[PDB]
Amino acid sequence: WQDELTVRGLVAALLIGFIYTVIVMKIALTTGLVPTLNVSAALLSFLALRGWTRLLERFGVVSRPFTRQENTIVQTCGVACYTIAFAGGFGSTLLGLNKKTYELAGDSPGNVPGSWKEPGIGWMTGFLLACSFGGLLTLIPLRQVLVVDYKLVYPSGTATAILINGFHTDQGDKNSRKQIRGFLKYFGGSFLWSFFQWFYTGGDACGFVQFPTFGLKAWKQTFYFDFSMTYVGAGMICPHIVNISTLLGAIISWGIMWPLISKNKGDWYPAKVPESSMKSLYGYKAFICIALIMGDGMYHFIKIVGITAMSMYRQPSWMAYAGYALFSVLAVVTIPVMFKQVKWYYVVIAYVVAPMLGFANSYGTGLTDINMGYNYGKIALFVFAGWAGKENGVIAGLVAGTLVKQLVLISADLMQDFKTSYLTQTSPKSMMIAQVVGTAMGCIVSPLTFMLFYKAFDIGNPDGTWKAPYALIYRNMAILGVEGFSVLPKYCIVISGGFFAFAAILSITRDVMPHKYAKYVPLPMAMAVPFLVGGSFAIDMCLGSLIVFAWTKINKKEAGFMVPAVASALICGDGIWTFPASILALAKIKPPICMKFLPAA
Amino acid sequence: WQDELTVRGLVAALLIGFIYTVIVMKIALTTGLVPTLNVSAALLSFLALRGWTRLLERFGVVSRPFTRQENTIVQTCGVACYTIAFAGGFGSTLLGLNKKTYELAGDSPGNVPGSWKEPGIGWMTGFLLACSFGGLLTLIPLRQVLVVDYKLVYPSGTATAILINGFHTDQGDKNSRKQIRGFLKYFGGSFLWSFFQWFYTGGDACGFVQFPTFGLKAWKQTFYFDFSMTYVGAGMICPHIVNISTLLGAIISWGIMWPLISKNKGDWYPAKVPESSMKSLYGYKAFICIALIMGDGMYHFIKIVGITAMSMYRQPSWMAYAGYALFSVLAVVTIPVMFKQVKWYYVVIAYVVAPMLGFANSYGTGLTDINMGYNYGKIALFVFAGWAGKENGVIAGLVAGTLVKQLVLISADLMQDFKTSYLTQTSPKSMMIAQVVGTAMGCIVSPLTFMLFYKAFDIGNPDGTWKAPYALIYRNMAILGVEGFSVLPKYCIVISGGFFAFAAILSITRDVMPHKYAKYVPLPMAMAVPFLVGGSFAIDMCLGSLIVFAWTKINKKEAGFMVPAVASALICGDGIWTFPASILALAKIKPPICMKFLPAA
Numbered sequence A, B: 001w002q003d004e005l006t007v008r009g010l011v012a013a014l015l016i017g018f019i020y021t022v023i024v025m026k027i028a029l030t031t032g033l034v035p036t037l038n039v040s041a042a043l044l045s046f047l048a049l050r051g052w053t054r055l056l057e058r059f060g061v062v063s064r065p066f067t068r069q070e071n072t073i074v075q076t077c078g079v080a081c082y083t084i085a086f087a088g089g090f091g092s093t094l095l096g097l098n099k100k101t102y103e104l105a106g107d108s109p110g111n112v113p114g115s116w117k118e119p120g121i122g123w124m125t126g127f128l129l130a131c132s133f134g135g136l137l138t139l140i141p142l143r144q145v146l147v148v149d150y151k152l153v154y155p156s157g158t159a160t161a162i163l164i165n166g167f168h169t170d171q172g173d174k175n176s177r178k179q180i181r182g183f184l185k186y187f188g189g190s191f192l193w194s195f196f197q198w199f200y201t202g203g204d205a206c207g208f209v210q211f212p213t214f215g216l217k218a219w220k221q222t223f224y225f226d227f228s229m230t231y232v233g234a235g236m237i238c239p240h241i242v243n244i245s246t247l248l249g250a251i252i253s254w255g256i257m258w259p260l261i262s263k264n265k266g267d268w269y270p271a272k273v274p275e276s277s278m279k280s281l282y283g284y285k286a287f288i289c290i291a292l293i294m295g296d297g298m299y300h301f302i303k304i305v306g307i308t309a310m311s312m313y314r315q316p317s318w319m320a321y322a323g324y325a326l327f328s329v330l331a332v333v334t335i336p337v338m339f340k341q342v343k344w345y346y347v348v349i350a351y352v353v354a355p356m357l358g359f360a361n362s363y364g365t366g367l368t369d370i371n372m373g374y375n376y377g378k379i380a381l382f383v384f385a386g387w388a389g390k391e392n393g394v395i396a397g398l399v400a401g402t403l404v405k406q407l408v409l410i411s412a413d414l415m416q417d418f419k420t421s422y423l424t425q426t427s428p429k430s431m432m433i434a435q436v437v438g439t440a441m442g443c444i445v446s447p448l449t450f451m452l453f454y455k456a457f458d459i460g461n462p463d464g465t466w467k468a469p470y471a472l473i474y475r476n477m478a479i480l481g482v483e484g485f486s487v488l489p490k491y492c493i494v495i496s497g498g499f500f501a502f503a504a505i506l507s508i509t510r511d512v513m514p515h516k517y518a519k520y521v522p523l524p525m526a527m528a529v530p531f532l533v534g535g536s537f538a539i540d541m542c543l544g545s546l547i548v549f550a551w552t553k554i555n556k557k558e559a560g561f562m563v564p565a566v567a568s569a570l571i572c573g574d575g576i577w578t579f580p581a582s583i584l585a586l587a588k589i590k591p592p593i594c595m596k597f598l599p600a601a
């Protein structure tokens, strides 16, 4: 109630949200490769408030103690502010509504002349306010099921909680000193390792990140080992079945399926169209991946509904969904006003499957630490574009894809904060207040921050500094999506439906068999992540589990309490370097050297 | 007397000498990059005899115990056999006497038509027998002064002794178990690290060995860090002043002198002639390096002579030099018979400065673990070629350079064995018997091994498989050396004479000042090694001393007895991989990938 919600925290979150919005917005409008900055926000939240308390002590002013619960509140409030900058599709979808992006796509069916909208402070802020708080209300019922009931470990949320607890621990114990000193040795090593790596990533696909540890043939199949301590640290605190399932999905997809499907580059799909398109080999990637996720996701979401339905029949949960319905109606009557191309029942369907789609992403983030929310928006954009003809089809796909992405992406990114608050013993109700305040500030700061860049500079020029590549890429997705499911490659629906059932069978197979065999069943939607990202992420995850397996065998006692600290330090050290690395890209300081790997030419 | 000199050891050394001769001879005649295989010979000496003892035990035959002293004898006998293969100039100097190499050099003054000699079993064996045992006799007086008196640490000899002792230790102690287990963890890590590195050294100047850790500009100045555990391990057991002096010489030479001298590429020396030549910027490299070594070397050699002369005036050593004089006379009356181009007093001068030149190389190897003997032969080849005119000048330089190199190179390589025998408590007299037997076998096996390659295949063809590049490179040195000291670049003698005095001043400055200031004086001839090799070797040496400095501060007790074992494991692990790496090059299996570093082009 108090000592967590403060005025200095409100001020500190507003600044940290403002700079991080500027960093995210500038990176989004130049390269579109927005990095993860949640770990950095926790550190700057600590330094800013600790500096303020000590500075006032220097001047004689006395202040309240700055505790870990308050640090969690400030970090969560700040994260919610700048998440809207990249979750709102400011560089991908909302910028694709430009007349400039409309002209770049060219003349084609679907791209009718009335498919452009210009940015403005008035409608972009009003667009965000109605839609952004929809994700927050769904978090209240999901918080109990996922964070504590399913015991999902959010590796980034767990690492941030251990980082924050270390900042504020003041007790001298036999283990507390060993936890901090072990954390600091690997935090500095991970930070310096990431700092050293930066000087050699000075080109397209070159550096320690693109390291062909098993050869160049395997590397082209995304079966290498990048020297990423984030994924190695993530795998250390993930259960072995999650890591093995991740490797199993990489072998099935990139080792078997994609070479086999690619053998029909002229028969099943056209060979002139580039890959990464919905028409050539990426329709398989995107639709099979979601079917695996939705196949597992639908089984689980029904199970909570079924368990709850039986419980009520035998006899604050409905408070949240009542509030969600109120915000649902607000968007239904408001979004079509801004976009005459968007019909009212499009929003209703978007807000009905949003609890469904948000649950799967939060469950997926709680397993593999990978937020897939922007992948859901691509599917929703494609589907909603096919739900309208050549008229009002591109705008409908872009706008409806933005709603689905925000509801899905916000839910997963902000459950990482509830895992952090769970470990820091922070009050959930004070967490939700920080949710709304940060979201409210984000829905205001981000549109004005975007417009200051937009009015001053020239964003969207293919030949220029401020080029937003994903504005046109998302625009071309909607143009392609105007044509219905016919443009998908041959047998794309059939195989996706098969993997939908295959994911559902594994989910049943794990809950019906005894626990003495249930622990060997792979998780279908941990398998699905390596369908879009390569197998390098899977290999890093399995290396971390290999480290923990060996460590547990060598010393059972020490590995019990030291693995989380070492894993968090690896995640935080790579996470903290993302802030100086972003400032370097902010000032256009490129790496000097490129570490290229060649076939002994 | 016994239990060290055995018949199975004689057999085992003969085989190990024979294969290693074949490996060295094939590598010398194809690339000329003969690697160090002394560490590998110790392991194969252990496995061959241990396998023999266990196999006879399997068949019921009983045999004498195989001890560490016998393992030292077998390794030393084997090393002496195959050292003659590359110390004898079979691919550099003796092969440069060919009519084929004579024709490749072309028509020029100095390259008179009578400057070729053809290989044969008769003269090549007789050439080796007279000259090879000259180096062995000089070892007896140098053994006391360098190994035990000056307390010089031979890092490769020390590492081999620790490797051999670990093989034969059978006592369970509080520390013996920790020494072996610590050694094995870093031996396997170093071996696998070198094995992993091999797949990416698949090109000219690319791999972890050519890693620009401080940038591409510093790398071209040879101021990078190669990931070599041999030099890192060598620096761990070398005193800090040796490592700091090595870094100081690299900064003075490659950081100051060579950029400054290179600013006169048209005024001081011609710009059309390539570098690495005695006429362009390598006359500075070679002559300043020897002057630093000879400046320090002459001060020391006089000091032993002065101390001994005073000791005798106040009142087996002369046994060795009496035998050396007898072998000296044998070569004086025999070498001019084979080579009418070589005069009798050329051999006398070569055999008089040989105790001098051998002492400096053994002292240098006892500090930095770098054998410079083949660098002495280049200087001796150049000087002796200028001591004869256009007539009989190229052959005189090549032959006399071969004598000087063998006397110098054998002395340094075989003092590494006396350090090994010192730590293994091996009898010096049994060591010297293994010296002669291995040398006698080497003087026979190597000429026949060479001729089998020579008769069967075509060695010396610039466009072919068996190309011996250094046969022509050494031939061109003698042709250039026919012209006297005039061809050396401008001010080469003046600067070399200055560094000769500067090296002598530091040697005096260290013996006359009190020990409380004498320990900060740099060693002039540890400084001289980075004049020819780059500063990457110096940086690796200093990193090893940095590791020991930190380890000593953190834990004084453990670093006392664990540093030699960890350092030896790093040296041995990289050393052992040299055997499989040579077999791969033996079968022409090239690395698949090249790790190239580019300026972000």
Ligand SMILES: CC(C)CCC[C@@H](C)[C@H]1CC[C@H]2[C@@H]3CC=C4C[C@@H](OC(=O)CCC(=O)O)CC[C@]4(C)[C@H]3CC[C@]12C
Residues within 6 Å of the ligand: A212, A213, A214, A215, A216, A217, A218, A598, A599, A600, B192, B196, B199, B592, B593
């Ligand atoms: C004991 C543990 C630490 C094992 C270490 C991992 C090995 C199983 C890996 C490390 C290096 C890998 C090799 C690295 C490089 C290649 C090159 C690759 O050849 C290429 O395709 C290169 C490009 C070309 O030559 O066209 C074939 C596989 C291979 C031998 C890899 C096979 C698997 C290796 C030996």
Ligand SMILES: CC(C)CCC[C@@H](C)[C@H]1CC[C@H]2[C@@H]3CC=C4C[C@@H](OC(=O)CCC(=O)O)CC[C@]4(C)[C@H]3CC[C@]12C
Residues within 6 Å of the ligand: A214, A217, A218, A221, A223, A224, A251, A254, A255, A256, A259, A539, A542, A543, A546
């Ligand atoms: C133990 C942990 C730390 C991970 C170690 C895994 C690797 C040692 C292995 C396991 C899976 C293997 C991959 C499994 C499947 C393939 C598919 C295969 O792909 C193709 O058939 C090529 C298709 C084409 O020709 O385009 C090539 C080998 C590769 C990459 C293998 C390379 C080596 C991998 C990554």
Ligand SMILES: CC(C)CCC[C@@H](C)[C@H]1CC[C@H]2[C@@H]3CC=C4C[C@@H](OC(=O)CCC(=O)O)CC[C@]4(C)[C@H]3CC[C@]12C
Residues within 6 Å of the ligand: A192, A196, A199, A592, A593, B212, B213, B214, B215, B216, B217, B218, B598, B599, B600
């Ligand atoms: C705390 C310890 C571990 C310090 C780590 C060593 C640093 C002092 C080194 C590591 C990386 C080095 C950098 C690596 C690469 C370059 C590129 C180099 O630029 C080039 O010349 C590249 C080629 C080109 O761009 O033309 C300038 C020096 C610099 C910044 C190096 C400066 C020194 C650095 C920062």
Ligand SMILES: CC(C)CCC[C@@H](C)[C@H]1CC[C@H]2[C@@H]3CC=C4C[C@@H](OC(=O)CCC(=O)O)CC[C@]4(C)[C@H]3CC[C@]12C
Residues within 6 Å of the ligand: B214, B217, B218, B221, B223, B224, B251, B254, B255, B256, B259, B539, B542, B543, B546
């Ligand atoms: C602490 C231990 C482990 C070694 C670390 C040493 C490096 C951090 C420093 C010390 C010496 C430095 C070098 C000292 C001298 C030079 C000479 C200088 O050479 C030139 O002036 C270029 C000449 C030309 O233009 O051709 C460039 C910097 C460089 C390579 C420096 C690069 C960085 C080095 C290797």
Ligand SMILES: O=C(O)[C@H](CCN1CC[C@H]1C(=O)O)NCC[C@H](O)C(=O)O
Residues within 6 Å of the ligand: A028, A032, A033, A034, A035, A085, A086, A087, A088, A089, A090, A091, A092, A093, A373, A374, A409, A470
């Ligand atoms: O969204 C995308 O597909 C790409 C790459 C993936 N983004 C980066 C972070 C991730 C996401 O949206 O969660 N970003 C485009 C520009 C900006 O990220 C935006 O979405 O407005």
Ligand SMILES: O=C(O)[C@H](CCN1CC[C@H]1C(=O)O)NCC[C@H](O)C(=O)O
Residues within 6 Å of the ligand: B028, B032, B033, B034, B035, B085, B086, B087, B088, B089, B090, B091, B092, B093, B373, B374, B409, B470
């Ligand atoms: O001698 C040389 O300058 C070169 C490179 C340096 N060698 C390799 C080992 C070192 C040496 O001679 O101690 N080797 C040429 C062929 C053969 O090594 C030989 O000398 O016959």
Ligand SMILES: [Fe+3]
Residues within 6 Å of the ligand: A034, A086, A092, A374
């Ligand atoms: Fe994005």
Ligand SMILES: [Fe+3]
Residues within 6 Å of the ligand: B034, B086, B092, B374
């Ligand atoms: Fe050589």
